[PDB]
């Protein structure tokens, strides 16, 4: 709704779609926006107008902005926290940790076409910490090796 | 199970407890799964059984996590077992 | 092949708790309890609701394990303690007894809604049929709830929402013969409770009558049975078992007065219930007793909408009550608070370099 | 004026300058700021002060912030939408699509020194969609090739 | 306190710590946040509630947001101004300008383990402009060389 | 090895100046000068202070070279010119003389605090012992200051803060026999100044008495000496030397009236000072003279807290005064405004490619 920020809200509508579809949908909207084909509309409050009724729009005016400002800070924060895995400044970060069939013995077509993100992140939830640890280790080894040349 | 023996013609107090030390919803039932007593938050209710009358609890101890069944004017015919329904701790006691 | 890829912007939620806040159409000039409370406790209502429907999302809801319920409980218990002050209050601490001044106050519940703090949103179940738990196949996201009028009552729930299409029977376990069954009606039944200004006699000043349509009551109860029979097809609504008077009789508070009503005429035109206004009240707020000031001279009445029932069955479904948290569950059953965890991972056909 | 955000406003004053000059101007201001030679001043409203006059500054206080918050979201959005052309996270993105003399048969010195951005984006406006399509294609081919090694 | 923004405030507590410790601390918090182990709490104002008392929270509500919005703009600005040294989009940017023993004749272990950032930036303050000039020059030469292939 | 690395997010501050703003608990309905000024000049106070303690940070403060002091001076001089308007004002411009209407006004100083503009923060010295300059070993960051009640006085500073544990002797150079020594007390001493409503006689209507406890004065002065002896162990508090009457006697303004008090009974129960209310005032605002309206008929009194002294020594430390900037230094001594410069550099064991 509100409270999540534009970054999340523009992606949230894909919650009921497959993983593959979500990636394609984001690509398409970006194309239309870059080309000047479609425009993004605002959903922000108009501000009080009448002094006697102003509490109605200054309370919600401020709360709406607080939600957006915090969403920006969270977005920008994560974009740099990801430097640990070598994924800073990115939406899609491909790395060198191989996928374990023990985490999930499925093909990529099965995962991307017959599942949604809501399901995928439940099937492998108990390996999340394992994988995250490995991502950090891989980044450390890459940095080690580059600095030896 | 916990077995409590009286003098037949008197009174017995059987107890259920919770580790929360809070007043929580609870019920007491006999072996035929018929309600005897229980609460509804702060309020005490009675079960529509042979023990609908002659029975009470201690509302003041509910916030200590203590939910007793007190049967008054006790008869030998009341010497059945009883089941606690406190959280999932379905403990059993017997009245003699 | 099959390398780990990290994705940011993954539309995945997890259930979460937070210090959820209230909003209402508070006034601050009419002296009434809810509007002199809500003016410092709650913010103005949301001027721009979003209702985002999340496609084909299916979400597992559980009205009996929800947290929004506890939060509503804390605000209402604060509201009552801060307004309908008893003359004498006895809390079982030996006991601890205090007394307070008893100005009488207007008391007319207003809808209050709960709103998500920044970073959170509320998922809502939009199914016409939903039994209170398990997957809901039509989910939308909102910031604020519909609004619940905090009526505190037993046996019959007044001024709540309707099920719209069918009477819905909701229970954590419909067969355990322990939990209260919440029956949400798809139609409201009017109840007109009056204490006329001619009751000036004393031992009278505490008597009142509630008038219920026979046609409406009979149709509603027949419809309830039709659903009860689906669950229990081999059996063919009775007197309460007994207990504290707030459970045994129907009870409510209007105009600041505490009414207790005999419902055996309903569960066995113009069906009349015998009602009495009482001063010694068992608190719903916790264990203890309280004395309230004697009745107001004049004519006091309220016309309420019966929107649901609390029924129980043993090992002939009887009216039940108490446990105010359950009345709020009957309205909060469709909502949960979630947070978004945008960082996720999946195998892909790529590698670095 | 306001309503555009700091990202645009700091660039907008170059609207009357040549393309070459605009690039140099941005470079210079960045140098002075990084070095601690110059400072950026604020142009934000002071907030109400007096309760009886507060409508004047809460309406405009909120509107000024709304403009800035939306400018931030647009900036950050475009910075990732550009991932399609392989230009995410950048102000200046050099790519491998060659310039067509048919789009504009001019030298780079003529374009950068004797023209402003206002003129340049009009002379080639009817090729904008062609070029954008090619930019996407080139990025797809680069990704295809890197992942074949 | 406030007025600096979340970017600074999350780093400011390290002002009394050594340089080495500060880097490690940032790494750890990022790990805990990426893994979903810890959560960031908000410190934002609740908004007025009561109309008659609203000046108290609309003045400070707006000022708190102004501070955060400006912090975001400064953060994003610097992240691109740094393109001059070839450090755009980064927190830690390693370059090819060698360290001069004349700027400071110390080892890296002495600097990172026995000093805080408050001390380090004072000991070499009179070389700051020299170094910054060299960083720009190095970036220019790198760009020159890459574009000759 | 040892290559330059650029780091962003470096927690390093530098001292800076800015258009610092005021906040106070202003009222706008009581007609009093500070609350009809602050209502347009200052914002509501900070509802959510942070007090971030910066670890083991050591910071060099200097109360005599601070800028916050000048900023407070500009607001107070504006406050007085905009309120306590003289009937006759003479500024040495030949001279330029103007006259103004003289309504009398209530005059009761309120605490006013200074707050950092966005992009800035204030560092505060939390040491119990701090002599006004040099490294402070316990530093926290705040947006707003404690709040200074802008009492304008000489010799004795009224209604300021206390040193809590010890009397602190602060001087730019304790041995140059030129600068004023600010003595901050760790305890307040009460002074009760009254002009009773029986002084209706005229040549009287301008006489008032200030009552000081002997026990409190003697203990305080003994404690001051104990510290003075650490600095000056070979010597064992005297009459002022003379000068403008605002320096020679103690002076203050309460109720809008300007009081001048004889302090020789203090510096040589119920010690009484002889006080007079005067109409011709030498301005502290700049060089010039001003006439104020004659005394109010009725009973005027103020009870104030002595929180510090201004003493001087020549080449027996005498009361001093004037230079209002110094009274404000005694409260602003612990604060400085800084900015953060997040971009820094250091050598590391890495290279590009
Ligand atoms: C479900 O919702 C419905 C609304 O849709 C609720 O129904 C309302 O209930 C309230 C409370 O009973 C009722 O309010 C009264 O309306 C009267 C209209 O004339 C008012 O006069 C009355 O105020 C008097 O009583 C108050 C205290 O009870 C006093 O505080 C107040 O000062 C007034 O008292 C003076 O005047 C009387 C009359 O002369 C005299 O007797 C007193 O001594 C004193 O001098 C209330 O405002 C609404 O009118 C009802 N609304 C409708 C449409 O019928 C219903 O209560 C909700 N259900 C539940 C369970 O909450
Ligand atoms: C240190 O702090 C303390 C507080 O902790 C300060 O002490 C306060 O000082 C003020 C100013 O002297 C004093 O205020 C007066 O209180 C009186 C209470 O009865 C009021 O009556 C009086 O108002 C009258 O005088 C005003 C002008 O002086 C008029 O503007 C006003 O209209 C009133 O005047 C009418 O009424 C009087 C009385 O009948 C009559 O004589 C007049 O002619 C006219 O008709 C002030 O409000 C506070 O009471 C003191 N507070 C305490 C707790 O004692 C102290 O001043 C500070 N120290 C320094 C140096 O600033
Ligand atoms: C999911 O629930 C929504 C909300 O009730 C349904 O959409 C509404 O449909 C009615 C007509 O019946 C319209 O008047 C409303 O304006 C619609 N609301 C919104 C937010 O779109 C929706 O049809 C339901 N979907 C399914 C599959 O059951
Ligand atoms: C640095 O100063 C702070 C602020 O006074 C000290 O922390 C306070 O300590 C008291 C107890 O003496 C508590 O009641 C306060 O709540 C604390 N305030 C804060 C903001 O934490 C701190 O102890 C001092 N540190 C040193 C080393 O002197
Ligand atoms: C405050 C704020 C910050 C950022 C955003 C934001 C908006 C859109 C995207 N777009 C995206 O994620 N895509 C997927 C990857 C792809 C395909 C090849 O590149 C491009 C499209 C990202 C962030 C919104 C608000
Ligand atoms: C919300 C917000 C976000 C970003 C900005 C912003 C400010 C300045 C620039 N600077 C720039 O575009 N330059 C041109 C390229 C160059 C020369 C080699 O690198 C450096 C200078 C970019 C974004 C402002 C506000
Ligand atoms: C508006 C706003 C914008 C950005 C931020 C922000 C928060 C945290 C970081 N994190 C960081 O600097 N780290 C150091 C380097 C490392 C170790 C290997 O990568 C990761 C951790 C950066 C920016 C906050 C607010
Ligand atoms: C999967 O986990 C096992 C340990 O259970 C390990 O031996 C194997 O190498 C792992 N495979 C991948 C791709 O990580
Ligand atoms: C529901 O109640 C029945 C009857 O007592 C019992 O057998 C069953 O295990 C209960 N199920 C749950 C989930 O509690
Ligand atoms: C209650 O009174 C209203 C008129 O005010 C009437 O329309 C309604 O039908 C009555 N309800 C009952 C149950 O009699
Ligand atoms: C209830 O019904 C009886 C029918 O005889 C009627 O006299 C009475 O006035 C009604 N009361 C109300 C409140 O409608
Ligand atoms: C209702 O009144 C009848 C008498 O007519 C009595 O037997 C019954 O117990 C009462 N019911 C309640 C719930 O008070
Ligand atoms: C049920 O209540 C109605 C009220 O009109 C009464 O006529 C009927 O006799 C009652 N039946 C029983 C079994 O109590
Ligand atoms: C309730 O059921 C009992 C049998 O258990 C019967 O005796 C009683 O009359 C019934 N009461 C009502 C109001 O239906
Ligand atoms: C029920 O009450 C209404 C007034 O509220 C009246 O018009 C109607 O005639 C009453 N019905 C009966 C059966 O008394
Ligand atoms: C009862 O429902 C009707 C709609 O059928 C509505 O007009 C009336 O206001 C409702 N009454 C209450 C108390 O909610
Ligand atoms: C320019 O467009 C023509 C088609 O009209 C095409 O054949 C030629 O290769 C293009 N040149 C470039 C540099 O794209
Ligand atoms: C250090 O500065 C001197 C000039 O004083 C220069 O000759 C030398 O090459 C510099 N060394 C480095 C690493 O920059
Ligand atoms: C402090 O005063 C003494 C005595 O006059 C003088 O010798 C010394 O140089 C002064 N120090 C400073 C820093 O002014
Ligand atoms: C001033 O008067 C107050 C009573 O209002 C008294 O407590 C205080 O001790 C007095 N101070 C002096 C110095 O006499
Ligand atoms: C000061 O002390 C003298 C002692 O004789 C007393 O008469 C007088 O009233 C006191 N004045 C005040 C303002 O307390
Ligand atoms: C105080 O009064 C005495 C006379 O008792 C006088 O000698 C002295 O100079 C006066 N002091 C001041 C500061 O006015
Ligand atoms: C100092 O003042 C006190 C006031 O009580 C007086 O008794 C004493 O004689 C004075 N001493 C000198 C040296 O003036
Ligand atoms: C101040 O000192 C002088 C000597 O320089 C002495 O004559 C005078 O009496 C002293 N006055 C007081 C009040 O101590
Ligand atoms: C000082 O004044 C107070 C009243 O303010 C009085 O009670 C006390 O007795 C006085 N002390 C002396 C020595 O006169
Ligand atoms: C003087 O200090 C006491 C605490 O010891 C305080 O209660 C009183 O209000 C203070 N008076 C003034 C004028 O600040």
Residue numbers in the entry:
A (entry chain B), D (entry chain K), E (entry chain E): 512 to 660
B (entry chain C): 1 to 96
C (entry chain A), F (entry chain D): 33 to 125, 197 to 306, 325 to 357, 361 to 392, 412 to 458, 467 to 504
Authors' account:
Ultimately, a 3.6-Å cryo-EM reconstruction revealed that GO52 binds in the predicted pocket, and major interactions involve conserved Y586 and F522 and a rarely occurring (1.5% of sequences) F518 that is found in B41 Env. F522 now becomes a secondary contact to GO52 and is trapped between F518 and L537 (of FPPR). F518 forms a cluster of five aromatic rings (F518, F522, and Y586 of gp41; Y40 of gp120; and the methylbiphenyl group of GO52). Interestingly, the entire region is ordered in the GO52-bound structure and can be fully modeled. It is possible that increased local order is therefore a result of GO52 binding. Although GO52 causes a global destabilization of the trimer, it does induce a relatively homogeneous and stable association between the FP, FPPR, α7 HR1 helix, and C-C loop of gp41 and C1 gp120, with possible allosteric effects on gp120 C5 (by C1 stabilization).
HIV fusion is facilitated by the viral envelope glycoprotein (Env), a trimer of non-covalently linked heterodimers (gp120 and gp41) (Harrison, 2015; Lee et al., 2016). The N-terminal region of gp41 forms the fusion peptide (FP), which becomes sequestered during the initial steps of receptor binding by moving toward the trimer interior (Ozorowski et al., 2017). Here, we identified a pocket in gp41 of our previous cryo-EM reconstruction of an early pre-fusion intermediate Env (CD4 bound and co-receptor mimic antibody bound) (Ozorowski et al., 2017) that is proximal to the FP and contains a bound detergent molecule used during cryo-EM grid preparation.
